[PDB]
Design a protein around this ligand. Sequence first.
Ligand SMILES: Nc1ncnc2c1ncn2[C@H]1C[C@H](O)[C@@H](COP(=O)(O)OP(=O)(O)OP(=O)(O)O)O1
Length: 309
Amino acid sequence: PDREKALELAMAQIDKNFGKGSVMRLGEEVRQPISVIPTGSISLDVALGIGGLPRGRVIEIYGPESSGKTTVALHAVANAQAAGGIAAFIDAEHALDPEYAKKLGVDTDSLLVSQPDTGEQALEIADMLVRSGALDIIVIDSVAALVPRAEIEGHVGLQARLMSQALRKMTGALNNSGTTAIFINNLRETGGKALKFYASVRLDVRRIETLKDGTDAVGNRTRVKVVKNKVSPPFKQAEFDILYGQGISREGSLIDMGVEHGFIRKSGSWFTYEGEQLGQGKENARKFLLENTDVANEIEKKIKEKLGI
Ligand SMILES: Nc1ncnc2c1ncn2[C@H]1C[C@H](O)[C@@H](COP(=O)(O)OP(=O)(O)OP(=O)(O)O)O1
């Protein structure tokens, strides 16, 4: 009684019992469900397997201070908006900057922003906003800031239940609503034990290295390791460039990928897309595509095919 056919026989018994991707073969490039939201990072998009954050899924983006977490999230908001979506930001950090947001594609003016007082009020006005079935994406700034009713008033219990409760009720909510929920986490190098088991995707955003280009510093090179993923196979990672005051670099992203995929070449550190050269050094080819969007288009259109959709 053949293993191969005796494995899938039962391995299939599992999905049917515990969900879609409860058991995946790290090798499979399967792709049966989409309605995903581009993260504006072609590299991270593919690393996700479904070319973006699955909608209707609770997502967690954790990492140290100044890693790129929120930038990605706002980048998520930018797209879900630019496609006729309604985005809500449950600010509890009071740090969000419109000026930087708007410069990334966020229709600030028409962005719902609620500034809770208690961790409970936050998780409510959020779970409640989700139920209205109007939102497409909702991101919550600072899982840390979500402090309970008391504490704010006066070991003795924990907030980590405040998360299990609202998450229990809210996880099933956005499930049949199609509203993807981003939760932003932080520095340790609590309630994070409940979210770690609900998120259908959990990204680990660490700032791999500092971008310079001969002046002071512009942005940073960020690396993201999708450690949990129930839509596609996990453990894949991606890198990209985040320029100070401009966001993620689509242009420079097309290059990193362009070459890693053999569409552009590198003789003497001189990037060139078949026949016509771009320039020496990366920060210069980035400045090349930054002007001619046609040449960058076909390059974006060539990589779009080379991989899953
Ligand atoms: N308001 C802004 N104006 C200009 N550049 C900014 C602004 N906010 C952030 N940046 C740039 C410089 C930061 O080094 C870079 C990455 O920061 P961010 O992507 O905000 O990190 P982060 O999201 O991991 O930190 P946090 O824990 O607060 O979410 O974005």
